[PDB]
Amino acid sequence: ATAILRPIGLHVEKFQQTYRKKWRFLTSANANVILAEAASGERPARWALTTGMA
Amino acid sequence: ATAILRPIGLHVEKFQQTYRKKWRFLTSANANVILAEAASGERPARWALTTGMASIPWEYLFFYMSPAEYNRMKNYPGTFAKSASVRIRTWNTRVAFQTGDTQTANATLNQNKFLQVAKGIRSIPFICSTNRKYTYSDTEPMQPTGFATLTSYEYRDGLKTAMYGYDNDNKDFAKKPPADATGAEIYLQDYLTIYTNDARATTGTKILAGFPPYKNFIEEFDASACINTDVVAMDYDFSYAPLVPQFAPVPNNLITQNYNGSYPAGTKNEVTAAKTTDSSQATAPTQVRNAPRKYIQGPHADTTFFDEEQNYLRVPIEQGGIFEEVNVETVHDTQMPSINVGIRAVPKLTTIDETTQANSWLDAQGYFEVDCVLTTESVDPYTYIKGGCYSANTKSQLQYFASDGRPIAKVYDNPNVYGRMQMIKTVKP
Amino acid sequence: AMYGYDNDNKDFAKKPPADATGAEIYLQDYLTIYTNDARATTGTKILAGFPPYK
Amino acid sequence: FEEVNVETVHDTQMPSINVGIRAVPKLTTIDETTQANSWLDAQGYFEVDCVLTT
Amino acid sequence: ESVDPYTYIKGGCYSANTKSQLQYFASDGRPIAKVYDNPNVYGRMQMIKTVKP
DNA sequence: CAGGCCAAA
DNA sequence: TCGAA
DNA sequence: CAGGCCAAA
DNA sequence: TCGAA
DNA sequence: CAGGCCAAA
DNA sequence: CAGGCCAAA
DNA sequence: CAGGCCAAA
């Protein structure tokens, strides 16, 4: 029995794209210093310890 | 030495899409009858010989993509149709047991059934045939007796309407259900016609050659043994077929004063040339460069053709020679083969008093399943950092334009000249 | 149509039991595809037509 | 239907079987490019064997 | 990745019903989205209303 | 290419 | 183990 | 033995 | 490399 | 054959 | 020892 | 991945 028609489904077309970038970053070596942050609104007063990793 | 950077070039993204359709066509077996066509304007008086092979419109875009696919394809600039393919298979051919006439009909179980196929008739220099629609007689539905007023554009529009239905808001929506949805058949009504000069009104010297033997250029098969068989299989790689204009490049006039500078092309022909010929031999052929043309994208774009969608069903997909690129290129004229298929008329069993062809014919219909595929490609350059896609300057495209503003395009409906297609102004829809 | 009527029914002679006779049963329920009728729609319209159910 | 037993439940449905013969166009010619205007009568013959286990 | 359905014959691309997408919205109309700038709670990100540019 | 979506598997 | 693998 | 001619290849 | 070998 | 049911595994 | 916890894997 | 365009080879 020859099949003139078959369930070929929908004609769905799928596209793929890729994006490449190269960046150069300069980061300073900050000291580890304790800074006082005042309370404001919902934020309570807290001590802050900075770190040099960007 | 480590390389932190390398010439990675541009970020060009290429998309490929394919479109598949399956159509069922019914073609009647017209008789071979000579019809007189009166002279009108530039057309001289001519005798017309009808033939029963219906044409397969595989050179047009609606044959491959639905309106939704075409509307979405409009959103991808730089869309070039790379290839097309068509396969025609034949099913059981039907022949009437007996016609409406009953006094002399002589119904018969036995039947002779022949199928004619033509592939290169349109490109033959001397045949000068064309595709026409007839008006059949009441007593003999297989005997044409004239020509219908429907042009090729109207015929293709009606065929597309039969294929894809109407809009939901149209009042005639209930008339023609979508064949692409139902799987029904579509009666083909455009058939081949051979032509010859009508010497009756000619004054002076006359050409009395008659019709050319066009039967020597067509295949013919026994339709009884062709049940469920592949008859036609054609592939066509398009030389140049821009469906959507390329991305508009960044103009160099806003940056550099050098934009108008010239540069030597050498002996190479960088500009396409139009050739005008006269088959009446009253004037020698002429080749003209710098033909009137204008850009199809950019600051001074003229997108009349694509806005009019002439390439959907009014103009064939293949448009080589029409479109020029500013890139260092080579261009040659291109055309597509013409597929004609149909059943030969079956003579009635009644006897004939004199030696001549059949006077009456049995009704017949051929059943053709057509599977068509169209493959296209698209490009997005991403040349500049901001402001969307822009293409390179060398990718700028121009199209031939008439002095009155109408673009010039190929048409396959007119008969060929010198085995070549003819350029003509597009007509506004 | 498949199983006939009860013996006390007046219409018992109309439809013999197909399970007993082996006769056929004409089917009368067929599939129907649907699409929106945009003729009376006011404002934006959906003009997609029928889906390719084939 | 739910049970008081510690259970897992998911929605269920059955496939729909549709079978039938396509209409046969009449041999008469048609003046314009469109589908068939008249059709020959046709009937398909289907033997269905069904089993249910409980 | 991208997808074009071509579900219907005419009128451009239309997707299936099951592909319909909803987004969380505040009672005032501003959509809700993830932000990685605020500190985590329970090792989890926090949903917050987007601010109009 | 039918059973809770298919363009997922 | 509300298919069933 | 169909695509810019075929009687050319 | 406006088919394509 | 006992632990979120057993007539399920 | 980075992705909805780590002292679980 | 430079020489008459590159997203063609």
DSSP C15-43: S--HHHH----------------TTS--S
Give how far Cα B63 sits from Cα of B73, B234, B307, Å.
Answer: 15, 15, 19
CB-to-strand L under 7 Å, chain B 327-356:
327-329
DSSP-assigned beta bridge partners for residue B16: B377
Burial class (CB in 10 A: 0-12, 13-18, 19+), B26: buried
In the complex, which subunits touch B with 3 or more CB pairs below 8 angstroms? A, C, D, E
Chain-centre distance for alpha carbon B297 = 26
Q: Specify the nucleotide whose C1' lies closest to residue E44 (CA).
A: K4
Tokens of B140: 């003999």
B283 CA vs J2 C1’ separation (Å): 111
E41 CA vs K1 C1’ separation (Å): 22
Q: Does C48 touch chain B (CB under 8 A)?
A: yes
Tokens of A22: 């190269």
In 3D, which of D22, C52, A7 has the Cα closest to residue B367?
Answer: D22
Buried b (16+ CB within 10 A) or exposed e, A31-44: eeeeeeeeeeeeee
In 3D, which of B46, B45, B50 has the Cα closest to residue B33?
Answer: B50
Can you tell me the distance from the alpha carbon of B146 to that of B132, in angstroms, rounded to the nearest whole number? 10
* Cα end-to-end span (Å), chain E: 28
Pick left, alpha or beta for residue B346 (phi over 0 → left; psi -120 to 50 → alpha; otherwise beta). Answer: beta
Tokens of B203: 């004054």
Q: What count of CB pairs under 8 Å joins C to E?
A: 19
Nearest CB neighbour to B168, from listed C49, C52, C53: C49
Give how far Cα B274 sits from Cα of B288, B292, B311, B374, Å.
Answer: 5, 10, 21, 29
In this structure, which amino acid lies at residue B274? A
Contacts of A16 in chain E (CB under 8 A): 1-2
In 3D, which of B254, B343, B247 has the Cα closest to residue B298?
Answer: B247
- If you search the block for the tokens 């009568």, which residue do you land on? D41
- If you search the block for the tokens 């013996």, which residue do you land on? C7
Nearest-Cα residue of chain D relative to residue C23: D47
Taking an 8 Å cut-off on Cβ atoms, the answer to whether D27 and B155 are in contact is no
Contacts of B169 in chain C (CB under 8 A): 38-39, 41, 45, 47
| D15 contact partners, CB below 8 Å, separation of at least 6 | none
The dihedral sign for the CA sequence B415, B419, B425, B429: positive
Taking an 8 Å cut-off on Cβ atoms, the answer to whether D33 and B184 are in contact is no
> Torsions phi, psi of B306, nearest 5?
-75, -30
Nucleic strand L within 7 A of Cβ B391: yes
Q: Quick check: helix, strand or coil at residue D22?
A: coil
Question: Which H or E run contains C9?
Answer: none
**Strands B361-362 vs B80-90: parallel, antiparallel or unpaired:** unpaired
Can you tell me the distance from the alpha carbon of B26 to that of D28, in angstroms, rounded to the nearest whole number? 11
Can you tell me the distance from the alpha carbon of E6 to that of E13, in angstroms, rounded to the nearest whole number? 5
Can you tell me the distance from the alpha carbon of B413 to that of B423, in angstroms, rounded to the nearest whole number? 11
In 3D, which of B253, B259, B251, B409 has the Cα closest to residue B334?
Answer: B409
> Torsions phi, psi of E47, nearest 5?
-85, 140
Interface of B with D in 50-69 (CB under 8 A): none
Residue B292's Cβ-side half-sphere holds a number of Cα atoms within 13 Å equal to 10
DSSP B268-314: S--S--EEE--TTSSS--EEESS-SEEESSSTT---HHHHHTHHHHT
In this structure, which amino acid lies at residue D6? V
Count the Cβ atoms, other than its own, within 10 Å of residue B258.
8
In this structure, which amino acid lies at residue B38? A
Nearest CB neighbour to B363, from listed D27, D30, D31: D27
Contacts of D18 in chain C (CB under 8 A): 31
Can you tell me the distance from the alpha carbon of E2 to that of D49, in angstroms, rounded to the nearest whole number? 46
Q: Does B380 touch chain E (CB under 8 A)?
A: no
Taking an 8 Å cut-off on Cβ atoms, the answer to whether D33 and B96 are in contact is no
Can you tell me the distance from the alpha carbon of B364 to that of B343, in angstroms, rounded to the nearest whole number? 7
Nearest-Cα residue of chain C relative to residue D48: C24
DSSP-assigned beta bridge partners for residue B424: B409
Tokens of B198: 């009508």
The CA-CA-CA angle for residues B51, B344, B104, to 5°, reads: 110
Chain-centre distance for alpha carbon A33 = 28
Asked if residues B407 and B315 have their Cβ atoms less than 8 Å apart, the reply is no
Q: Does D20 touch chain B (CB under 8 A)?
A: no
* Cα end-to-end span (Å), chain C: 32
Q: What is the widest separation between alpha-carbon atoms in chain B?
A: 101
In the complex, which subunits touch C with 3 or more CB pairs below 8 angstroms? B, D, E
Extended strands (E) in B63-167:
80-90, 94-95, 114-118, 130-132, 134-136, 144-147
B300 CA vs L2 C1’ separation (Å): 33
Tokens of B115: 């199928």
Q: What count of CB pairs under 8 Å joins A to B?
A: 15
Nearest-Cα residue of chain B relative to residue C42: B169
Extended strands (E) in chain A:
13-15, 34-37, 46-49
Taking an 8 Å cut-off on Cβ atoms, the answer to whether C30 and D20 are in contact is yes
Q: Quick check: helix, strand or coil at residue A26?
A: coil
Question: Which H or E run contains B330?
Answer: none
Nucleic strand I within 7 A of Cβ B324: yes
The CA-CA-CA angle for residues C27, C29, C30, to 5°, reads: 110
